[PDB]
Amino acid sequence: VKVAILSSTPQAYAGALRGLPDVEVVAAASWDAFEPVRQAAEAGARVLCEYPPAAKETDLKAMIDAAGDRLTFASPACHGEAFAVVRKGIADGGIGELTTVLGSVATSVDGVLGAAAPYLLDLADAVLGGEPAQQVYAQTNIVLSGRIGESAAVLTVRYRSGQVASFDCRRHGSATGLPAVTFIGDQGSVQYDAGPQLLGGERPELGGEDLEALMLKDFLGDGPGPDGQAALRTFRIIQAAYESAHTGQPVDL
Amino acid sequence: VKVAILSSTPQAYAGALRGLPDVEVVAAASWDAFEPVRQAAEAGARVLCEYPPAAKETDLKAMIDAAGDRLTFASPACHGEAFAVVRKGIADGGIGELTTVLGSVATSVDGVLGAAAPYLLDLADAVLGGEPAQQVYAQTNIVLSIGESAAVLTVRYRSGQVASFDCRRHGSATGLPAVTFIGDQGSVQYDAGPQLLGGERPELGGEDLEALMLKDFLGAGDGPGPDGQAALRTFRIIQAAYESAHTGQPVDL
Amino acid sequence: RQLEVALIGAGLIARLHLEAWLGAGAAVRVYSDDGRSRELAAEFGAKAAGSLEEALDGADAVDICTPTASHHEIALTAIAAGVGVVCEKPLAASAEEAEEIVTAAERAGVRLYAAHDVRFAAPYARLHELVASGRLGEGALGRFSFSAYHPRPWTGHASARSGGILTDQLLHGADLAHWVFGDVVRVHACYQGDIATPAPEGAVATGTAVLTHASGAISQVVSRWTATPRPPVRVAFHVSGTGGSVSYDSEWPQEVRVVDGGAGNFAYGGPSVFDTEMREFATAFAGGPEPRIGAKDALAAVRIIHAAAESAWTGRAVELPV
Amino acid sequence: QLEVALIGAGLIARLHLEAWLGAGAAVRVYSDDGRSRELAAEFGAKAAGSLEEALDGADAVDICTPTASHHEIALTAIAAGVGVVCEKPLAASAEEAEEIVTAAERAGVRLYAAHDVRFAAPYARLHELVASGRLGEGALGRFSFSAYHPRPWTGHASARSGGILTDQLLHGADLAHWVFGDVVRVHACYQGDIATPAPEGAVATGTAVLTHASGAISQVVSRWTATPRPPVRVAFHVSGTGGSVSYDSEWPQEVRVVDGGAGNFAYGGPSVFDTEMREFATAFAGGPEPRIGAKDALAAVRIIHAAAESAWTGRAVELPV
């Protein structure tokens, strides 16, 4: 199988993909210079991509046009066995009627709203059953250190069902990008943390599942990550959030 | 109220006490030269005393004789309202029949067995009602950065109850003990230095143990801290521990 | 001489405040229109006053422990008699009422505080101490969540437009955010659940607010009422600035922890927040240093919760001019 | 496909059977109670009519029988050229264990024991930190293993042997040995009625102080509790010159019910048995040696018998290198 990668850290995923047999990495690039990957998609390669920047929706459509269902969005935390447990517990009524999704993520990547919030919205979308959004409100700032774009953001989503999601994102040089999400229903709440603390101490040790291995397994074999429609819903959320951060008022969708 | 202080930080305590209404400090010294505190004790002062060095059993006995029931030993964790809750709950059967006391302490002071284990033994002694020790086993090492920097001792009481404590040196340690009481129906932990806030530099919670200890020293009733006989019990345990750490065998009391 | 405190009201909060005032060394006169004040006063050895006027006569301060809608007249009555005010939160039922009280207190030169209990408990006071002393650098982002089971019914009247039961819970988190990050200039909130009162014990609602601060810092404040006391209360926060992050979970074990075996007779909540609060207010009204919460903080809290309720109702964000 | 002879048909065997199959092995099951017949059918495995028949054509034997029978079952497989993985403890006496180790070494067959603790993430990560030098020189460790025993102990075991506490001590003793190295001195106090037969919920507490050749010291506490509140708790705190690391199994991990008390969100991570058998299967198929070797199985048995003797005689027991 021929494979291409679209990410801010393309050498990261290309190395793990070559480390498996029967697979060949024909292209790896960032969304800044995506065309070698786009031509690989036209030529038949499976493409694993992180979410594109909010400014490059035409590049996103070019990738959809080039690969069709051969395009897979990278959302590691969706592949946790822990996340399957949470989704089933909620669908079975473990927290009553679902009303609200909360959560937090820290990343080292600049522009944390576009770079990290999709990872939380992917989990929300899975448990919300792909509900469409009615309004998006967001605020951002550059207080914390970074190169370009916001280093902190909060967004709140009001869905057509009346359910609410609200997520906080921040930059930090040693963050992992691993999200923690909390699902609130009218009889309880449950938290899914993709990066819990395994060991305490002066240098705490990060626990969790081998989400990279699980995500690549699915991509080399429709799994629990966002399909194309789910990615487009979330990407539209992101665009609206950037607009709200500028207007200071929610954006209707 | 006439008071005398025998501690490694005598002026720190004298300054906290003098000028208070109805209070005057008639003597304040370290164990290196305790004669004015002995003399104040013979004249009737109440004395707040720190555990002495291992070489001063004779001076310890002299203080017990001079001050009688006016002697209190400085053991801050004994004075927490949290400890009174733990003591009451154990007395009321909350963990069934008490069998075992465990506990850990870290100190900056060198020679951690003599320097820090009395804070643990004092809490055991209070809950055990002064139960006599029968045999002590102990081991020490100097792996961490004179005098032992790690120690474990096990005490067998003639009731058949058991206490076992671990002590270690760290430059940033606070000396605050944490003790666990095990009975045949459960177990309960008194942590005099719990983590109040997390993050890169956790914050210590806890009570103002120094203020409560001085309040009880200056008060009327029987304080919750060790009296002269309790101090001598605990001193003898420590001396037996040091002997066991040298022989490699339990030492009889 | 002993500080003289007029305590107005005789409900549960009044009872907690009374114990704390007496423990602080103060002398208290209790008064409520429903007469409950005289058995309250008798149980604690305080004086039962026969009217509001007689409670105020010769008092140094009044502690207003009555429902919100009555704070305004009581406080103004107190200010006119030269008596300083401690008001149960929130200061008043509208921003306009709160401003009149603040203004009147200033013109008369008497002290005005509100009992924002959260500031007086160790996790939040330590967080503010870290932030104000510079150990977090410049504040950037904070999340706060206050969740509890309401163990008695809401018998007063409040409309969904006013935010209802969510307003009560939001006070804690809104005040904490303002305390740590500064003035709030923009508020957005989504309120979920049946939030009007009268409402039963165990009513469920979830309010999610985003506050933008004058510095650019942003806080997410979540206020919840839960269906069961499992647990009765949970508070959590995470605050990040250029100097690092500070976190708290009230579920973390503190000094007393039943590790196994299920024992129920080891409850320990820490020092009474009310003892800490009233002792600090006592010291202020006695001519000492000002407490950790001022008049402008009490007004801030009213402004923020009314902006939130408006945002929740209209679907717009609400700006607050400094 | 690797061929595994599974001996026994109890709860451990059932857990091992599922893990072997999940690792790709073919399995034949023999137990002397006959229950191996329906056990193998339930999982699609083979049923053997005898140990000799089970060993015939086997690459490895998995001994999931009572401890006292480990010595002769293991010696039979070794003499037949069959490598061995044995449930803990390796044998009923330190002397029996050493005999198995020597026979496996001379016959050149692999000999492992199922020290499950080494295959769960907190403990594997702890050993990784210590062995890579991240904590510097180990100095001090405290370990506690505490559980409610939900089945009766039906076998016969004297108080002198440590009884029920010996079962719980093998986790902590093995972990201390893994992390700090050879143990040269053992002291222990055992509290409670510990002889078996004994019922579910029997209460006992054992406190052991281990001195290591390096000079490091371990305090290991082993507990059986009256009620599953909680069913299991493990905690540790380990200090070296390079810092400290701690663990509490009560801490929340990937799935956490925050309020309301729902009970349908159970999640315990990867099965240690899957991780275990997969690593063992890989070794028997010429792969790398697993994280536990014959000399570790022998060390654990020596430690728990010295601790039982210490508790019984009131002496510390010296184990010079």
Ligand SMILES: C/C1=C/C=C/[C@H](C)[C@H](O)[C@@H](C)[C@@H](O)[C@@H](C)[C@H](O)[C@H](C)[C@@H](O)[C@@H](C)/C=C(\C)C(=O)c2c(O)c(C)c(O)c3c2C(=O)C=C(NC1=O)C3=O
């Ligand atoms: C998430 C919370 C955090 C508070 C922390 C506080 C600093 C301290 O840490 C905190 C732990 C302690 O001080 C508390 C025990 C304190 O004693 C109680 C709040 C006290 O008010 C009770 C008399 C109140 C009741 C019985 C109520 O019915 C009640 C009310 O009537 C009104 C108008 C409320 O707004 C609340 C409540 C209530 O119960 C719980 C509430 N939320 C919290 O407390 C509320 O907001």
Ligand SMILES: C/C1=C/C=C/[C@H](C)[C@H](O)[C@@H](C)[C@@H](O)[C@@H](C)[C@H](O)[C@H](C)[C@@H](O)[C@@H](C)/C=C(\C)C(=O)c2c(O)c(C)c(O)c3c2C(=O)C=C(NC1=O)C3=O
């Ligand atoms: C303090 C513990 C820590 C284990 C951690 C391990 C990483 C893992 O987290 C571990 C928790 C999980 O893998 C579990 C599936 C674990 O495997 C199972 C309990 C497994 O033992 C069961 C077949 C055993 C029973 C039902 C018993 O009756 C039983 C026995 O008969 C004998 C002789 C024992 O010595 C123990 C038990 C028992 O129950 C529990 C025990 N102590 C612990 O577990 C014991 O020592």
Ligand SMILES: NC(=O)c1ccc[n+]([C@@H]2O[C@H](COP(=O)([O-])OP(=O)(O)OC[C@H]3O[C@@H](n4cnc5c(N)ncnc54)[C@H](O)[C@@H]3O)[C@@H](O)[C@H]2O)c1
């Ligand atoms: N964490 C621990 O310490 C732990 C936990 C569980 C089991 N174990 C160990 O596993 C072993 C017991 O296994 P269990 O818990 O499933 O007990 P069990 O009683 O449920 O299993 C015994 C099985 O082995 C069979 N058997 C007995 N003797 C046999 C023989 N000579 N040949 C063939 N089959 C025989 C029996 O018929 C039965 O099917 C012990 O070594 C015990 O210490 C240890």
